[PDB]
Every structure is written in structure tokens, then in C-alpha cells.
Symmetry: D2
Subunit: 317 residues, 4 copies
């Protein structure tokens, strides 16, 4: 028998004996992702083209409104907003959601895969809700995941007991569990980084890449892929294995990727799947935020590949 | 005042005083592509998962039957078929069609952007049609193009008069003309190649790559992108500018990409767009095929970038 | 802020402090209706028509499998099955569902509106579940409603606190609450019956109809409508007002419509909306079943119209 | 070996050595109907309901702009417009098109089946186009038909060679030919009329109705059906057989149905299908219009049923 995301979430919330506050939140997210998927695939575009009678601003408004109406949140952090968003008391819930409504928005014009990233924290210090409430290490995540709008739409949800992937059936608007308890390969054979910044890479990265192209033991070099869309690159890593890197350089001394809504959620997903997610010096999830839009270096993927690179880092210390 | 593919193809058939056989063909292509797009986004997967108690193969069948049902074709060449398909004399038309029904199939599991590529030739001769009718240099192409199933489904059609882009509106099942008479940029800022093969590159490629990462005139380096699906990489090249490369290496000293249904259509779109497509030695469209599944090295993109690499190819000539 | 069926159901289940067993059941139904709607609108028909590579049997299999997997039911009664269906212990829940998967199936060939009807009972006598468990008067319904596949798809759900209508947005696969706490007009102006059986009508009906066409006080006669699909006729009644009748005659001495899955659910819906639902002699909901496929005469609609007819019945007694 | 509307219309244009102007027109109609169908099934309603913070009018605009964008029309007559629409000489073609963009609009709130009706005339004359160009008897129709938005969306197209039915596959946005060269039954078993007007009927209608309920030769009575939407009632008549009637009464001694865009197209489809369409006195197609919004009585359906009533009309002549 088939398993939909709606059934799964509910069953899990029943086992966890929750009051159903999180369940509603996860039901709101799902509805939000289906709506973004539809707009991304361009339904109704003929109307812009005069059969007479913006995509990340819309996506932002969809996540915000749908999360608010779930009555399960109190603090919202969007890549698109400068400050955290405090929900009105009338709609307050106990959850804090950090999300990137549409990641890889430069790529929209080229029809490159894009996605939505989200991380959910439980408000802990019960004071008037505020920004500080979102400043929690990723180790404190109740749930995280992402929706990828690629050749098909997929939702990857990670929670304490594992990672699960749901495929969207757009004919009936239901996500079907297609992969249960996902685990990443120990060792991969694809590395993914923008080599256009080779001139600014630290020595460890430099040595790593060279080791991938020209392996000491004459083995096969790793294949290279770099879609340029984090959700897409990270999704291929999780599913196929390998390592993804966006280390610090010059144009980004602390990395380009934001911690709250890009790095933490993917680090969480990777960890539950049996992979590693480091900064080069430290685990991404243990970092204590100081700014909601903070950036952080990130290297994630199969444990052996990440370990190997980490060995090289120590070597240059 | 909206232009749909169906309206466009008809007007063009009228201006060219065609008998309507090529229009019927292009209409059948539009229909096959809409059908493939739908199976790619997974409409109906719930049934596979028992809601009531391959893709590469389905795509081939869709194109083949839809094309045959057009009564405008005599010879069909597919990446999936060892031998060329000769049409039943009952449905035999005068067009030769070369296609790759689903390119990037290995990427399906990762949900990377995939696509369909086709090149149309007019049967030149008067004897029984045969494989030999497809063996024409790409310079003889009547029409060529591709459909990209990415975040949105797009059809790019190139003919003598130029290149046009049609976005699929999945709500009404109609391709809408969104970019007319497209021209690639003279010079881009992105290079695209699988650097996992560095060990295998000839000295000209190696030096070019080096010039892009460490510019000798101290100009900003190029960004790197390599989705891993030709249609996706080329489509980004066409719209954003830059260069795409898949030169020869241990993986066949002859290149990986197939000439008839991958390189030619793309070389044809590029040239019509004001760009270049070369093997490093000769222009792709001028190669006289000798085998329907003949591979060939290819470099395409903005003219200035392609000419720069051609010069390096000279310097090592 | 918008309200989806998924949110609404959950919120209601939280207020009712249910263990979430019914909530899952209602979530399963919703998924089932979206799947039937898609098949009814003919998605994928091109495949039957050879773009190379039953509707009530399918609908039946969809309801059954989806209800079973909800783990919330123990007894299923379908118009399509001779005997009640006893769920395996592994999947048992406390609910009994009586449904007509696709009503108005003759009408399929003519594209006439069709629908799904369902009534839900709570297993009371806790013995090994069986048919007798379904033999409960409709007054014992926990929930009932229907999905109408007309110009648009709608789900009408009735429960103890009222009637609510949800419109299906097929772009995102979500039912949106569009009408809250529905109440029928006191008096209507449309009567609906198959006058083709005039020769077999009892005197009361005969007098009623004649009173509608030739009103004693020279008022405007009632308009007449008779789609021939109960869900469609009953839905226009509920929404617009009036009276619907399928009384006993000769070819059907006890009426044609079945009590468990056609009469009870619509009587329940009508009652919560402030309308009446009689047999001519008695209220439909108070009848105690003796057979699962039992038939029963039915007259329902606005209270004044039904009362008026009931007065006439008493008159001929 | 599947036939899509687009393929069919093209082949027919080719067999008739058309210049392709009528084909462009029929293609624009197919596109408008797909667009209307989508707005009817409510795709996107979630937006109306604030998911991110008329129908009659939208339908008119869709048909009007899509038709004008065809460059095959000079005069457009719509039920919604007081005056005929004269096309800008820049887009002026030679076709006159009469349509009711959304028939049964009052039924929208009840979700009853609704439809689009059109009749196409060839402008016969050489002076400035005007309203007067639409005033041709229906016998002069080049093409006529309708789209029914019911449980599935169907397009019925009638031309000189016959009547064909195309079912819309909303998954790929393509009409598929499912019923070829349709012929109505000689005699049916269903009559369709609004008996709420009994008080107003002329003696011929009254007697006929009486013959159907109480057959003088003791044969089975006719079943009654009256959805209340012409396209729905007529479409059922065409496919299942029988008779449909909307004679004159207090509601205009001239009938309710409009001649140019409701009666003629339907009379034309019926006649091409081997049936009859009469006002009781004359055939509908032979009436010479005098006003674009001229109403006319109509009776159509199986020939034997229509001839029986015509005889009664004689008996009271
Ligand atoms: N849908 C669910 N899936 C997984 N865990 C859940 C679910 N619902 C609740 N829980 C867990 O129970 C806690 C409290 O639930 P709640 O009352 O809904 O806020 C959450 O923070 C989770 O830790
Ligand atoms: N739809 C069309 N678009 C562009 N060119 C066309 C079209 N139809 C025909 N032509 C051209 O006219 C030639 C003959 O058309 P045909 O008679 O249909 O085989 C083609 O090979 C093209 O060169
Ligand atoms: N989704 C809901 N909507 C309305 N009432 C509910 C809901 N869930 C539970 N209830 C009520 O609570 C009872 C027991 O709930 P349950 O434990 O889910 O079986 C049901 O039989 C209803 O009476
Ligand atoms: N697609 C078509 N289907 C059927 N008949 C057509 C078609 N196109 C043209 N014809 C016929 O040929 C005539 C002239 O066509 P046209 O030159 O396109 O205006 C029409 O008025 C019809 O009588
Ligand atoms: O548009 P966003 O939200 O800023 O995302 C762009 C990000 O940019 C990274 C790649 O940027 P580079 O061009 O520097 O490689 C990705 O992996 C992220 O998706
Ligand atoms: O379409 P195909 O026949 O399945 O081939 C996939 C191709 O493979 C190339 C990538 O190959 P590498 O892994 O060798 O870079 C792409 O650029 C093309 O999409
Ligand atoms: O196909 P079903 O499930 O038997 O439904 C037909 C029923 O039949 C009634 C009308 O039948 P008559 O032809 O006797 O009026 C409706 O109101 C019901 O929908
Ligand atoms: O399409 P319109 O202009 O809105 O008219 C609706 C029509 O109205 C007739 C029904 O009228 P009565 O209520 O008078 O039977 C139908 O048969 C037609 O669909
Ligand atoms: Mn963003
Ligand atoms: Mn981002
Ligand atoms: Mn292929
Ligand atoms: Mn290929
Ligand atoms: Mn049934
Ligand atoms: Mn039934
Ligand atoms: Mn109208
Ligand atoms: Mn009308």
C-alpha cells in the first residue's frame, strides 16, 4: 500500500504523541511547496503573454502566509527579509522556521534546477519571541529538508529518526514516499565545486582537487559536476554520493552560503543520512549563530570523502 | 496577441509555400515533447506505487509513433536504436529525423534537467530510403532544436531564419513564444567542461582552462558550471553566454557526444544564434558522417570564447 | 488567510480531541477523491489512444485501497460489492464506511456530472466486525458527504457541527474551503423528478407536481431540472434550493436509490443544512437497515417544499 | 496511430486545398477552448482565496483575442456583446464567427456542465465587413460545433463531411479524436424539456409530452432529462438519442434560445449527424436572421421523434 506525505506526517505525529501543532506546520509547508512548484513550472504563463481577458517574491509570500496560517509558528527567518518576522500573537505557535523560499534564483532564466530549503527550531527561551530565538545551533533542529524543482519535484524531509524522500505526483497533488530511511554511500566518485575560483582556494582544497583529478594510486579520477544550484548539487550528493564544497576564498572570506537557511538544513539532512558536514575546522551544526544572515564555509557529502579532505586540512595546520 | 508554437509553425509553413508536410511534422514533434515532459515530471506515479492496487524507452516509443503518425518522415535515427528506422511506405513522407529522445538519462535518478534533441533533414535523392539518407553533414539540416525539461519545459527551434524559444504552459498544454530570434553573447563569463578528465586533456584545452582560472591580463576569472546534461549545459550557454566543451580523451579519442543527434542539432542552433561549434579542427556542421552513431568532439558557445581556444589549438598545431 | 481541507480536518480533530484515527480516514478519502477526479477528467486518455510506448471498477479499487491503508476502518460497504468488506485485523480501525464510488455511471458516456457518496459510522457493538455493523440508521452517522465531478470538482462534508464545501484547485491538488456552514433556503423554486414515470406515481406526488406547474394562487410555477445524476441534482438543491424526488413507483416499489450509500449520506447532509429528507411516510435517517443494498424512497430539499408535499401525503391517508 | 485535433484540422485543410486561413482559425479555437476549460475547472482558485496574500467575461475575452490573433476573421458576434465586433483591418481575415463563450453561466454556481458554442460563416460579399455579414441563414455555415465542460471536456466539430468528437486530455493539452463521423439514433427514449412551463405550452407540445408519459400504443414511456444547459442537453441527445425542446411560451412568444450562436450551430451539428432541428414550422437552418440577438424556438434530436411531433404540429395546424 502507498504512503503519502500527509499520512506519514500524521502517523509520525501520532507516534510522537504531539499535540498536532508540528503536524499542521508540516502540512502547511507541503501545501506551500506544491504551490511554488506550480508557479516554477510556469502554469498560467500564457496569461502574462496576452491570451487576453517575481518568482522569489511570490515564493516568499507563499511560504510566509501559509506558515502563519498554520498557527504553529512564532518566528520566521527568510533569506529574502533583512529582519526576522515575528508572528502576531493571535497566530503564534511554538515553532521558528528558517527558510530560503527559492534557492538558485539567478538560475531561473536558464531553467536550471532550483529549490526551497527549510529548518525548524522549537522556541526554547519562552520570552517575547524574537530574532535571538532563531540563533540556535543547527544541532537544535527538530526538522529540516528541501523541495527540489528539477526534472520532477521532490521533498526531502529529515527528522530525528531519519531521512525520507517524497516525489510529487502533480496529477493528484500528493507527495508519495519513494525512498525510505535514506543513507548516503560511504565513498563517492564525484566532487562538486566551482573551480573558477581556483586562484583563491586555500592549500587544503587545492591539494584535494588535484588528488581527485590525478589520484596518487593510479585509480580513476572523480567525475566533476557543478550545477550551481545548492539544492540540486546537494541532492545529487545525497542520492548518488560524493562531496560538495563551497569553501572560503577572497570574495567570500567566510563562504557565500548562509548558515541558518542553507547550511544548517543541508548539514542536518546529511548527518541523518550518515554523511558529514564540516566548515573545514568544525561541524556546521555545532556553530552558534550570532547573526541570522550569517555565512559559513561548507563541505558535505560521503563520510570518507569529507574525512579525507579533513585529514588534509589538519595536515596544513 | 500571443504566439503559440502551433500558430508560428503554420504561418512559417504558409510564408514558405510548403505543402504542409513539414508543418505536420513539427506539430507531431510538439505533441511528443508535451507527452514526454508529462512523464518526466512524474504525473501518475501514484499508480506505480499502488494507489489502486523505462522513461528512456517510453520516450523513444512516443517520438517514434508520433513521428510515424505524421506521414512526413521516411527515415528515423534514434540514439536508442542500433539501426535506423525505415518508415512503412504507407506512412512514408520525405523527412529524415535524427533524435535523442531523452538525453541525460543517467541523471533521471538525481532529478537533474534532461532533454530531447532532434535534427531534421530533407531526403535528398530518389532511391529507397535507408540509413544512408541520414548520413548528411549537419550543414544540410532543414530544422533542428531541443526541448529542456528543467524547472520549466522549453522548446528551442532553429530554422534558416533563426532561433526561437517557446515556453510550455502545462495548464493549457501550449508552447508560447517567449524569446524571438535569439543571438548568443559575443563573449561570456562561464566555461563548462568536466574537469574530472584533466589528466586526459590535450595541451590546448589544458592551457585554455588555465587562462580562465588565472587570466594572464589580470581580468576576472570565469565562473565554472557543468550540470552534466548537454541540453542543460548548452541551453545555459545559449541564453547566458560562454563556452561548453566535450573534447576527446581516453573515453574514446573520438569524443563522447554523438554527431547526428547530439552535436549537429546543437551546432546548428548555435550557428543560427551567432555562435560557433567546432571539434577544435573543423566546424561540426561540415563533418560528413560515416556512421549514424559516430561520436565527435565539440566545443560551442560565444564566438569570441570559441575563437580564443581555436587560437590555442593553432599555437599547438 | 486560506483554509484547506487538510488544515480544517486536522483542526477539527484537535478540537474534538480525537486520537487522529478519523483524521487519517478523512485524509485518505480526500486523496481518493482527487485521484478519481483526475481519472474522470480523462488524464492520460491519449495512452488508450495509442500515443504508443472501467471507470467505476477503478474508482472502486481506489476507494477500497486508500481507505484500507488509512488503518482507520473495519467494514466497507460499496455499491459495487455484493457483500460487506471486512478489513484484515492488521489494518483494522474503528470505522465503517458505506460508499458509492461513482454515482451516475450510465451518464459517463454523455459527460454528465457524476460523483462519489460516502457515509461513515463508528463500529459500536465490539464483536468480530461484520455486515451487521453497517446496518445502522443514518441518524448514527459520524460524518457524510460527497464529491461532485461537474464543471469543477467539489467535496461537501457534513459532520455534527455543520456542512462545508471545498473546491478542488487542480493546479496544486488542494481543496479550498469555499462555503462555510451551509444552510439551504427555506423555500425553493425548482422541483426535480423524472416525470417519465408519471403513469406510475402515487396520488400525492401527482398532486404535488400539478401544484408546481399550475399553482392555485396564480404565482410563478417552479422551474424543472433533472440531470439524472443524484449527486448533481442534490448538489443544486442544497446550493440553490428546491426539492428533489425519487418516490416509489412500479419498476421500483421501494424506490431505486439505495439507503446506506445514497439516501443516508444525502439525508444527513440535508438535515445538517436545515433541510428535510423523508420517505413520504418517515424520516430517512431513522430507518433501521436490514440489508446493506436496501432501497428506499426519497424526497429531500428545502423544509417548506418538503413539508408541503408531506401535508399532501397525510391528506391521502 | 492517434489523431489529435491539430493533426485532423491540418489534413482536412490540405485535402480541401485551403490557403490555411481556416486552419489557423480552427487552431485558435482549440487553444481558446483549452484555456476556458482550465478556468472552468478552477485551476488557481487558491490564489483568489489568499494562498499568497467574471468567468463569463474571461471566456469572452479569451475567445475574442485568440480569434483576432488568428488573422482569419473579420466579424465576431458574441452573446455577451450588444454589437458585433468588427476586426481591425490589420488582422482582418475572411471569416465571420458567431459564438456563445460560456453557455449555462447561471449554472456555474451549482457546478452544472457548461459549454462554448460557435458557428463559422465565410464572408460572402465584398464591401466593408459589418453586422450584416453575420446575418446569414445557418444553411450557409462553413463549420459549427461546441465544447462541453462536463465530467470531461469534449469538442464536437461539424463540417460538410460530418461530425467528429475530440476528448481533451488535460495532461498533455491535446484533443484526441474519439468518435468519428457520428450519426444520431433514428429513435430515442428520452425527451428533454422544462415542464415547469406546462401552463404555457401550445397544444402540440402538450399532446406530445402526454404521448411520451402515457403511450397510446401501450409501449414503454420515455425517460425524462433536463440538465438546464443546452450544450449538455444537446450533447446527451446527439450521443444517446431522443429529443430536446425549447418551444415558445410567455418567456417570449419567440423562444429563449438565440439563433446565431445557440440554435444554428446545434441545428447544423444535428443535421450533419442525421437528425432534425425545427421551430415546429420551419427548419432552423433556413430561417433568414434579421437580428444578431434574434431568438428562435427549436426542437432537435432523432429524426423519428422530431417527425412525430411535427405531425402533431400538423394536426393542430
Ligand atoms: N508530525 C510529527 N512528526 C514527527 N514528530 C512529531 C510530529 N508531531 C510532533 N512531533 C514531535 O513532538 C514534539 C511536540 O509536538 P507538538 O505538540 O506538535 O508541538 C515536536 O516538537 C516533535 O518533537
Ligand atoms: N512550418 C514550416 N516552417 C518553416 N519552413 C517550412 C514549413 N513548412 C515547409 N517549410 C519549408 O518548405 C519546404 C517544403 O515544405 P513541405 O512542402 O511541407 O515539405 C521545407 O522543407 C522548408 O524548407
Ligand atoms: N477530524 C475530525 N473532525 C471532526 N471530528 C473529529 C475528528 N477527529 C475525531 N473527531 C471525533 O472524535 C471521535 C473519536 O476520534 P478518533 O479517536 O479519531 O476515533 C470521532 O468519532 C469524532 O467523533
Ligand atoms: N482545416 C480545414 N478543414 C476543413 N475545410 C477546410 C479547412 N481549411 C480550409 N477548408 C475549406 O477550404 C475553404 C477555404 O479555406 P481557406 O483558404 O483556408 O480560407 C474553406 O472555407 C473550407 O471550405
Ligand atoms: O540565488 P541564491 O539564493 O543566492 O543561490 C545561489 C547560491 O550560489 C551557490 C553557487 O554560487 P557560485 O556562482 O559562487 O558558485 C549555490 O550553490 C547557491 O544556490
Ligand atoms: O543523452 P545520453 O546519451 O544519455 O548522454 C548523456 C551525455 O553525457 C555527457 C556528460 O558526460 P560526462 O559524465 O562524461 O561528463 C552530457 O554532456 C550528455 O548529456
Ligand atoms: O449509476 P448509478 O450508480 O446506479 O446512479 C443512477 C441513479 O439513478 C437516478 C436516476 O435514475 P432514473 O433514470 O430512474 O431517473 C439517479 O438520481 C442515481 O444517480
Ligand atoms: O448560455 P446562456 O445564454 O446563459 O443561456 C442558458 C440557456 O438556458 C436554457 C434553459 O432555460 P430554462 O431555465 O428556461 O429552462 C438552456 O437550455 C441554455 O443553456
Ligand atoms: Mn532565495
Ligand atoms: Mn539561497
Ligand atoms: Mn538518450
Ligand atoms: Mn544523448
Ligand atoms: Mn456506483
Ligand atoms: Mn449510485
Ligand atoms: Mn453566454
Ligand atoms: Mn447561451
Amino acid at each position: 500500500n502507498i504512503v503519502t506525505l500527509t499520512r506519514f506526517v500524521m502517523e509520525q505525529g501520532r507516534k510522537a504523541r504531539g499535540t498536532g501543532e508540528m503536524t499542521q506546520l508540516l502540512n502547511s509547508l507541503c501545501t506551500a511547496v506544491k504551490a511554488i512548484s506550480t508557479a516554477v513550472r510556469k502554469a498560467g504563463i500564457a496569461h502574462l503573454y496576452g491570451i487576453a481577458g517575481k518568482l522569489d517574491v511570490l515564493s516568499n509570500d507563499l511560504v510566509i502566509n501559509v506558515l502563519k496560517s498554520s498557527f504553529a509558528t512564532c518566528v520566521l527567518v527568510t533569506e529574502e527579509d533583512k529582519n526576522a518576522i515575528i508572528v502576531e500573537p493571535e497566530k503564534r505557535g511554538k515553532y521558528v522556521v528558517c527558510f530560503d523560499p527559492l534557492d538558485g534564483s539567478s538560475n531561473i532564466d536558464c531553467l536550471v534546477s532550483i529549490g526551497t530549503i527549510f529548518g525548524i527550531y522549537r522556541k526554547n527561551s519562552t520570552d517575547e519571541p524574537s530574532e535571538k530565538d532563531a540563533l540556535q545551533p543547527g544541532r537544535n533542529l527538530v526538522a529540516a529538508g528541501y523541495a527540489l524543482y528539477g526534472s520532477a519535484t521532490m521533498l526531502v524531509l529529515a527528522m530525528v529518526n531519519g531521512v525520507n524522500c517524497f516525489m510529487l505526483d502533480p496529477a493528484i497533488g500528493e507527495f508519495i514516499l519513494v525512498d525510505r530511511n535514506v543513507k548516503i554511500k560511504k565513498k563517492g566518485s564525484i566532487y562538486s565545486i566551482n573551480e573558477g575560483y581556483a586562484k583563491e582556494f586555500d592549500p587544503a582544497i587545492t591539494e584535494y582537487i588535484q588528488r581527485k583529478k590525478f589520484p596518487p594510486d593510479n585509480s580513476a579520477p572523480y567525475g566533476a559536476r557543478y550545477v550551481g544550484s545548492m539544492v540540486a548539487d546537494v541532492h545529487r550528493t545525497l542520492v548518488y554520493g560524493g562531496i560538495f564544497m563551497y569553501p572560503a576564498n577572497k570574495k567570500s572570506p567566510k563562504g557565500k552560503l548562509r548558515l541558518l537557511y542553507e547550511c544548517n538544513p543541508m548539514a542536518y539532512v546529511m548527518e541523518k543520512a550518515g554523511g558529514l558536514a564540516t566548515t573545514g575546522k568544525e561541524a556546521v551544526l555545532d556553530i552558534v549563530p550570532t547573526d541570522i544572515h550569517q555565512r559559513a564555509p561548507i563541505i558535505l557529502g560521503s563520510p570518507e570523502d569529507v574525512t579525507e579532505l579533513l585529514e588534509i586540512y589538519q595536515k596544513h595546520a
